[model samples]
Target: MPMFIVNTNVPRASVPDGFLSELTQQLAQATGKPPQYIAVHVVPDQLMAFGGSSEPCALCSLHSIGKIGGAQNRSYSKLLCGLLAERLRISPDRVYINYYDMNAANVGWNNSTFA
Candidate 1:
């Protein structure tokens, strides 16, 4: 459950046209069914955090797919769900998210790289 070993930080915010949402839409469009039968979950260190002044560090917008969750990219759903579940009064189960590890090198920054 410890996603990070060192002191960690993450951003949070709403996700518009999130990948999962879009996928659900596309699937619905293709299958001609109500966009149901979906669920998502996200677990954080559950011990790392900061004050409102540092909230900007957690600010995130899932408008389009891109580098998210620091250098470790993830669908906007995961980041948004995590934030909403934590900051806002929402349940991750009602959201759709995907999680995966991102190699810092795979990201577009050199400093993020770790041996």
Candidate 2:
């Protein structure tokens, strides 16, 4: 399973329609994972400070069972940053992403562990 969490300083309303869906789809494709097993969480309109400024910024967290490395990270950054820049007007330089490679046994789903 892959978990995607996006924390944006912009209000929820500022996130344009279909952005999340598109992100989920892109993540699935980039990760070579099934969309049904992916989980996405979005936190918007939060008072977040970055570099001592209140500028529009975003922090994205991506966790998955495996198959993640440098290439995927770069691709995700490119695509996701472009998306945020276009949709929410957030600069790519202002965005940050954290990628977590999880062990199957550590993640529980459907009342059981995938491992």
Candidate 3:
């Protein structure tokens, strides 16, 4: 499973339509996960700043069982930041992405943990 949580200073209305769907599909491809198992959350209109400026910026987190770390993170960063730039007008340089390699035992699904 893979999940994306994004927080941005841009207004919700400014978020491009179909952005979530596009992200889900992209992430699925990126992580080799099925679309049904992928989850994406975008929280807009937050009071945030970067580089001493209030320009649009975003903080994003990706949680997955695998497919992260090392050089893979660089590719993920490029893909994610590109999407954010295209859909939310957030510059890649202003966005931060954190990757979490989740333990199956800590993730609940179907009334039980993935473990």
Candidate 4:
């Protein structure tokens, strides 16, 4: 499973319709993962300031079990950043993403551990 968390300064209402569906599909295709296994949480209209200014910006994180590596992340980064830039009108320089390689045993799902 892949969980994508998005924290941004933009207002939630400003997000275009159909964006979440598009995001889920794109993420699944890019990662070669099941679309149903992806989860995304978007937090908008936050008091966030990047580079000492309050321009449109976002902080994102990807948490997943296995299938995370340096070379892979490079591609993922480009894909993810492009989405932010294209969909939110946010510049690539204003967004930051963090990836975490999680252990299955440490992740719980459907009332049980993934392990």
Judging by lDDT against the true structure, name the best candidate: 3
User: How accurate locally is residue 86 in candidate 3, as Cα lDDT from 0 to 100?
Assistant: 85
CA lDDT of each prediction against the hidden true structure: 0.36, 0.86, 0.92, 0.89
Which lDDT tens digits does candidate 3 get at residues 1-115? Answer: 7999999999999988899999999999898899999999999999988988998899999999888888878988999999999888888999999999988899999989996
Clash pairs, model 4 backbone: none
Model 4's alpha-carbon lDDT is 0.89
Could you give candidate 1's per-residue lDDT for residues 12-72 as a string of tens digits? 3333337345545443443334556322222323334345332312222222122335444
Sorted by TM-score, highest first, which candidate order results?
Answer: 3, 4, 2, 1
What is the RMSD, in Å, between candidate 2 and the native fold over all Cα?
Answer: 1.1
Assess every candidate by TM-score: 0.23, 0.93, 0.96, 0.95
How would you encode candidate 4's per-residue C-alpha lDDT over 82-104 as one tens digit per residue? Answer: 98899888898999999998999
Clash numbers, per candidate? 2, 0, 0, 0
- Residue 109: error of model 1 in Å? 1.6
Comparing 1 and 2 on lDDT, the stronger one: 2
Better of 2 and 4 by TM-score: 4
